[PDB]
Amino acid sequence: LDIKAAVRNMSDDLPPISDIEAMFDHLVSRIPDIVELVRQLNGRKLRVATMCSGTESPLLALNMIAKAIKAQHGLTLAFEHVFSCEIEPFKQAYIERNFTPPILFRDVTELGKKRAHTAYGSMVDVPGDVDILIAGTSCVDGESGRTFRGMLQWVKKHQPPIVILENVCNAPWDKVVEYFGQIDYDAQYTRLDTKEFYIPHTRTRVYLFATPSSSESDDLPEKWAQTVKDLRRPWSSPFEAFLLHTDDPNIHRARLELASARAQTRKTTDWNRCESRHQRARQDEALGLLRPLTSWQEAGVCKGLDWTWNDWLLAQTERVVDLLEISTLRMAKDGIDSGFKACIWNVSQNVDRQTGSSKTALAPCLTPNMIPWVTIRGGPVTGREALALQGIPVRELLLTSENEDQLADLAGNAMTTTVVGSAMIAALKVACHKITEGANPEKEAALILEKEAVDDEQVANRIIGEDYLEHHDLDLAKVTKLSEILDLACRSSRHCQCEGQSGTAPNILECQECSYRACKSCGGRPEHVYAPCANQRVEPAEFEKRFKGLLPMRVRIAGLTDQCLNAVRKAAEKSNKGSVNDNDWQLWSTALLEGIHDAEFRFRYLKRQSTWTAVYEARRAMLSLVLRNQIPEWRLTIKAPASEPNNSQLRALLLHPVARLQIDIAGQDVLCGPWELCIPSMKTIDIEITGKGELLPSWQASLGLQGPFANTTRWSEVEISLQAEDENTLDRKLSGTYQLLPRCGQAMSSLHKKRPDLSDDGLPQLYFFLDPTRCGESREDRYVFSTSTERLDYGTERPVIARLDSHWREGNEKQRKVKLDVSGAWVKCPEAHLTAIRATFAIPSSASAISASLTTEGCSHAMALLSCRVPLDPTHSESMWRRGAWAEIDLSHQGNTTFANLAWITERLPPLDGLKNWAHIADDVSEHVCERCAPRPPKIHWITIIAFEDKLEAGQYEHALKHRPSPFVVQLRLDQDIGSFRIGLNIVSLAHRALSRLPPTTSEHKISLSWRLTPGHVTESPQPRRVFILPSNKQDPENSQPEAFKLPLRKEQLRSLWWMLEQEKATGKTHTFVEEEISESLLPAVGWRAEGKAERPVMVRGGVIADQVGYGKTVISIALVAQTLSLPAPEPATPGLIDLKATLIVVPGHLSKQWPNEIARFTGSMFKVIVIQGMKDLQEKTIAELGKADIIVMASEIFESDVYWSRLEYLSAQPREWLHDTQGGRFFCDRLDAAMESLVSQTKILKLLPNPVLHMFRFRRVIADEFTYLQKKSLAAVLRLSSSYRWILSGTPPVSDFAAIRSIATFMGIHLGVEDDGEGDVQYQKARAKDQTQAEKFHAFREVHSRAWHNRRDELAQEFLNVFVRQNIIEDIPTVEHIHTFKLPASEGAVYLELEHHLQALEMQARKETKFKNVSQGDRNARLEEALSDSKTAEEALLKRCCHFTLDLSDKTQDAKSAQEACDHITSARARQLLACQEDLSRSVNQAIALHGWIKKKGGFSKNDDERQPFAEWIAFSSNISKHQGDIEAARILLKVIEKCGVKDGNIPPSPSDKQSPSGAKMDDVKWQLREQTHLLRKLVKELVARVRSLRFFEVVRKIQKGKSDAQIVLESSECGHKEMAILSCCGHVACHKCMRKAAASQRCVKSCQAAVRPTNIVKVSSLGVEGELSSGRYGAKLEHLVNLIHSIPKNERVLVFLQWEDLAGKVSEALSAGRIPHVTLSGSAKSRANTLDRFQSTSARVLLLKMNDGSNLTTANHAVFLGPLFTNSLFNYRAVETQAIGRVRRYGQQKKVHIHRLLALDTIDMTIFNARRTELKEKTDWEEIPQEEYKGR
């Protein structure tokens, strides 16, 4: 066939091919002329050089070419990756991990010179000779081609014989060939399609071979292209063969970070431009306006079909989510059910860009800016799966912390390996000559044998030990022993699709008429009849082990000779089934015998799907233990031969399993019973479907399609009829009546359930539904009639009973003839048997035998941890084992496959016990690093400053890191029929690694190295951050007294003072904290994580108090200073130093004026004090001036001052511009490091130095009084200076994570952690990743840790906390509550009453604010919403209006000042919006009439009755008062439509008209645009109706509130025939309560209201309010009760209020002056809130007006007065801000009785929220309530 015809949809004759090795094997089998390259090399080594290739698809393909060439012709050709270039750090880390090029450069522009920088920073010379070169997508771009010309300088100089490019179709290719001809290179570009070379991806890219000119009269590129376009072979395997399974540890992890990321967390764009296009499409294809995949409301309110990765759908945008709906509807109406056909959408493209509904097996182009969507999974294409569509093989990949966008970059800007391999092989073949052969074979072969002979010894001597005890022989027949296992299986199997392969989902729900289990969170759109799940859950980790003990490992089949089958068919011939044919029988029996004979099935893995299953791989078949809940069994499947066409008669008949083994429930053994064969014998039978029952909307109708699928009916039952014998031959008695289960989803919502019948009593339930084939035309999909409905996987087949014809679908007909087909007849077989089967293994089982034989500089050797011996068959054996000598196996590139073929051995071994605890030699030699296990990272140089790196040290660091001992070593051999493989850990290497990462100190301590090994380690799915708890400080004895202070210590500061004394004393305590640096190494598949650690004990005196303002931290620290006085406990000293006995405090600037005044207030005069503010005090006093001083306190700005650093460098003997920086980053840290190295020498030399620096000399004590304030520049200052004891004081301790705890511990002196920049948050990583050298940013991606190595550091941080960190946080005081409740005055109460129902009418909750382009659509929003003024949401406005009456608070130009006078403005302004509505409705009708006439100028609609017009039918229906219109609402529509244009007829031109058409032209654009105008007009009609209905309601209630003759007259307008009466909240419909309760229940009042009404709306007219009762007119009733309460307090207390609304606070502050309660408002100034709070707390102003979110001590304050409940989103944040401020007043240090007051309104949303808070807060956290007592005071 032609290539285009073939690649449009996959050829059925090309064999299915998905293995990249088989791809390239076939490609080499194509051309046999490639050996000419072997010859023209003559023993040389080919020289490749890629540039910006991305993922080295070149080298992947070329390795596979070399392996293929050897496989066919027995000829070896080698090639040496001379150098690669790549710019992006994560890309080059990926390359270095997965390939290890010997040279890897930064940028191509540099490499036109004699040397360049490699990725590391080595600056090696450019190589100079290559043979083939490949540039890429990223370099071909005087600025545009900065890279392209830079690469051309390389090409011109070095003249490579072959050059290949790769890029998009739309590139300046002619200019490329011009630039090539500039330097004499023959170039020809051609475009080629990825789908044309073996892969079902669709990508077209443009290539061009190059070669130097004048090689011949021939033009080489033309012949090259002719050969390349010959190398075409279309796709034949669906993209479902390149996809990983859904429950796969790399995909389920991808689902889990999505859920976890959502668990941590607003950006609203308007898609109004494309919205009209979406509805236009829905209108055009006649699709409905439904949303059947995910019913989406807003950005993130959607709800998928429970199996659809819903946490991804929540994160998309509205356009994408809607386009998914439009796609599923287009794919519907074509007989195709999306979600059950395997296909893929790329939904980033706008609507109508693509035709869509393409060939299902194919996949669109996966551009870097893609948002793909796998249909049948319900989720995005995982990046690892986008890399396998580029031909890259993904098994042995190393990925370390890549995003999905960062990895989509790689997968999109890649080279399809088959395509580049074809281009290379044609290029090399055509340009085979002109190659500069070496042709010296034997001198090279000698070196080849030299390298092999030296490494064959090197691997054999790497293992020491093996004298450790061998352990008892294991037999593979561990069949050691009933249905308790089979029900442990049910209790352990999967219950929520989101569970995966080891997960527990709370609140499982199980259905009836079908057993579909799902979690309560992700379940309910395909909802169907649930009930909670009964059974309790066993962990699968615990189950699987009991299962493993039940299983053999190698099994074989005994029976099934030939000619036994030849009598198996005889009995079925005697029986009524019949044998259809003999050709198929021969072709089947043949391939069955070569699958059974000579095959030892080996155990591979266990599937934890909703049913547990075990899998056994052979050479030519597979075996599966199914372990069903009912009828567990074994099924055998035979692999069809690899070289078979897709439409093969053999391959087809070898698709379903071929043999069956019913596990005997009686028998306690797994393997037992008879074997039944599925003989291939297709059968023709005739059936009679009958449709009876109620008719239901069809599947398409339920989706809401509007074409011929507008309304279509299908039956609710189906009565199936089969012939007697034609029933008896089939095993299951399948004739009955099947009830449809529409809520129970399936393909086309088709789940029919068998009714319970007779004699099928104990048997699984049989379902009948539709199941598509994941590929192929709609007419492929059929009815399954099966016994299971589980969501299967690729390569798993459904065990079905009989299939039905493919032309049934659905209907509503009475009965019809249909053809059923069944093809597999099972027949008994007793001759089959399944049979299980001097092995050893050297478990060391002696943790000390290794430790004894361990020696220093033994890093070269691998201490043997395990050995084994197992009998294999040397025949039909595979090449992992090596005959004769140990072969090592490189784990990084072969470990997954290796350990996947050894699992049948590895899962009989016992777990390595005796190794969990760690013990080893002690007092080890310190600082003796290996410099082979742990190289010294190079010194980084600094010089607008760029982090430069030292090239010379970089090269040694490179070589050393390249040559490091692999911590685990695996070796295998097959000497004589007995395979022996061993595992060894390089323990001393781990210890040497951990030794290096532990910085040296001048300590008299010696570390101890140790090591441990833990089995069973499993990779960890994400959990949330661990919170860090601080221990209390009350359980200890209290220090007696300070014997100096004049004031007591309140009995809760004594218990902490004793704690500060005991540590600065440090009784006993050879060492306090043990700093532990661990290093690890993973052996994944076996599961061992072997970790070795170094411990250093350190003894340090001090801690962090971490206590909040209003606590006597200052008092307690002056106490600790007084106690240890004249007591010279600190022993050590630098040999040259100026140590004093003073103590130092570091405090911020505005808190320094405090501290000496508290010594003065307290004892004072018992020790000399010096405070220093400002630099010109350090100049003032010398060293002997500063002498004889006990306590010194410094402002933090002294370090931030730069004359301080000038003095520091002057005493450091540095140049005067050294240490002179304005940014204070990592560079200034080195400027400190060198200086501090200088200080020790300077002070070692040699007083009264006039201007000393604090950093030069040593203290008795340093106290960091605030640790979170100290800026990033001045923190480094306070981290250096030395002291005998270390104290940190802080109101807020920075204890949020490890990176925050480490900042404290560095001040302490501990070294609990090391930097890695892979542990912080995504935010925090960036602020440090801007300071990284370009090589460090690369080194971060190179190595990654285990998420257990972080948890252990978390544990060590917690252990640091529990020793050095205390916190005093438990009822201090009587905390009483006083719920004050309002009566509604109805002077402003009714003002409130109109708001909630006005907002109910307009149904607007919040003001949305987004990007509006349409000037006449955005203003209609800014005006409609304008009534909810000065606020964000309905709750906020309702609270503001229940606190105080006012239309709106931002505009103070007009002031109501009274309740009725405010109602006046309410009525006036609301009539104003009514007129605004009618006048927007004015201009809109005119524009509609004009656009209507725009059809008329063109002339009719091409027919008198071409179509009904939306606008026309809206007229003459909105133009009468007949029906579907308010009693009085619509009479005001005629007054506005007729005045423009009268009766329906004519009036084509408008009476005023400015622009007849805003308007290229389509004549359908304006048509459907007029339709949109009709819809908008209907909308506007609705708001008019609401506006007038609410107006009538409010004027009615204001009538009673006025209480006059009009009130009584319209009171007697009851209209209910009666004359106590309730009012409708929607309009004035005063009809009596007696009938009107039934009116509101029946949802229809007596009138011709107009809209349905709720019984909760009703109010009693006598219950509205009484007038003249209380003067609630001057201000809000809340404000006057506030005045009353604050009057009622005694004058001597203190009051604070919160004011949760700052807008309301402006009015509250003014109204408080009416009560004349002098107040502070906490505003009016910036940064002068310090004086705000110093006021009235130094001693005046009583009451404070807080903000409820705007560290200060409120100890003077006694009464909190909340003034209305706070409005907030989450209960967590509610309680956080609620216990906070409840904490601000009575935290500690208070000698009062705290009272909490609430001013709430009885009939108001404020109580509606208060009840919601109370009735839910007591359940969660079991929050402690406070006693409630009525405030009587004064």
Residues of this chain that interact with Zn ion (CB under 5 A) are 496, 498, 511, 514, 519, 522, 528, 744, 859, 930, 933, 992, 1616, 1618, 1624, 1627, 1629, 1632, 1649
To Zn ion, the closest distance from the beta carbon of 630 in angstroms equals: 18
121 labeled binding residue: no
Question: 964 vs 1328, which CB is nearer to Zn ion?
Answer: 964
Distance of CA 1499 to the CA centre of its chain: 58
Give the shortest CB-1123-to-Zn ion separation in angstroms: 49
Tokens linked to 1532: 């005001």
Closest CB to Zn ion among 305 and 1689? 305
How many Cβ atoms from other residues are within 10 Å of residue 984's Cβ? 23
**Between 932 and 1792, whose beta carbon lies closer to Zn ion?**
932
Beta bridge partners of 667: none
CB of 768 to Zn ion, least distance (A): 14
Radius of gyration of the chain (CA): 42
Cα(311)–Cα(293) distance, integer angstroms? 14
Gap between the Cα atoms of 1575 and 1424, Å rounded: 17
95 φ, ψ to 5°?
Answer: -65, -45
**Closest CB to Zn ion among residues 929, 1348:** 929
Minimum CB distance to Zn ion, residue 497 (Å): 6
Nearer to Zn ion, 498 or 718 (CB): 498
| CA atoms of 1553 and 996, how far apart (whole Å) | 85
Minimum CB distance to Zn ion smaller for 23 or for 514: 514
CB of 529 to Zn ion, least distance (A): 6
Minimum distance, C-beta of residue 1567 to Zn ion, in the bound complex (Å)? 41
Concatenate the DSSP letters of all residues of 42-65 into one string. Answer: TS-EEEEEEES-SS-HHHHHHHHH
Contact by Cβ (8 Å): 1489, 1548:
yes
CB 51 within 8 A of CB 101: no
Chain CA centroid to CA 528, Å: 29
Nearest approach in angstroms of CB 1806 to Zn ion is 27
User: CA 1822 → CA 1378, 1770, 1777, 1819, distances in Å?
Assistant: 21, 16, 17, 5
560 burial type by CB count under 10 A (0-12 exposed, 13-18 middle, 19+ buried): buried
Q: Does residue 19 have a known ligand-binding role? A: no
- By the 10 Å C-beta count (0-12 exposed, 13-18 middle, 19+ buried), 446 is classed as exposed
Is 1111 annotated for ligand binding? yes
3-state secondary structure of 683: strand
- Smallest gap from Cβ 757 to Zn ion, in A, equals 19
Classify each residue of 883-892 as buried b or exposed e, where b means 16 or more C-beta atoms within 10 Å of its C-beta.
eeebbbbebe
CB of 19 to Zn ion, least distance (A): 35
Amino acid letter, residue 618: A
Order the strands of the 1008-1014 sheet from edge to edge: 1008-1014, 1089-1098, 1073-1082
Catalytic residues: 139
Q: Give the shortest CB-1616-to-Zn ion separation in angstroms.
A: 5
* Nearest in space to 637 (alpha carbons), one of 653, 654, 625: 654
CA–CA separation, 1513 and 855 (whole Å) = 97
Nearest alpha carbon to residue 1321 among 1350, 1349, 1342: 1350
Residue of this chain nearest to Zn ion (CB atom):
1629
Closest to 227 (Cα-Cα) out of 27, 75, 508: 27
Q: What are phi and psi of 20, to 5 degrees?
A: -65, -35
User: Is 1821 among the annotated ligand-binding positions?
Assistant: no
Of the candidates 1211, 1181, 1225, the one whose C-alpha atom is nearest the C-alpha of residue 944 is 1225
- Using CB atoms within 10 Å of the CB of residue 1303, give its burial: 0 to 12 exposed, 13 to 18 middle, 19+ buried: middle
- Give the Å distances, CA to CA, from 1365 to 922, 1034, 1060, 1220, 1292: 30, 13, 11, 36, 12
Residue 1112 marked in a binding site: yes
CB 1763 within 8 A of CB 1799: yes
Identify whether the C-beta of residue 1751 lies closer than 8 Å to the C-beta of residue 1786: no
Q: Is 1110 annotated as a binding residue?
A: yes
Beta bridge pairs of residue 606: 614
As measured in angstroms, the least distance from the Cβ of 1341 to Zn ion is 25
**DSSP structural state of residue 617:** E
Q: How far is the CB of 994 from Zn ion (least distance, A)?
A: 11
* Helix (H), strand (E) at residue 767: strand 767-768
1107 in a known ligand binding site: yes
Nearer to Zn ion, 122 or 294 (CB): 294
H-only helix segments in 1452-1563: 1459-1498, 1510-1514, 1531-1537
- Under DSSP, the state recorded for 970 is E
Q: Within a 10 A sphere around the Cβ of 1652, how many other Cβ atoms?
A: 11
Determine the longest span between alpha carbons in the chain, in angstroms: 124
Q: Distance between the two ends of the chain, CA-based, in angstroms?
A: 102
428 neighbors 211 (Cβ within 8 angstroms): no
Given the complex with Zn ion, which of 259 and 829 has the nearer CB atom? 259
1113 annotated among ligand-binding-site residues: yes
- Show binding-site residues for ATP: 1107-1114
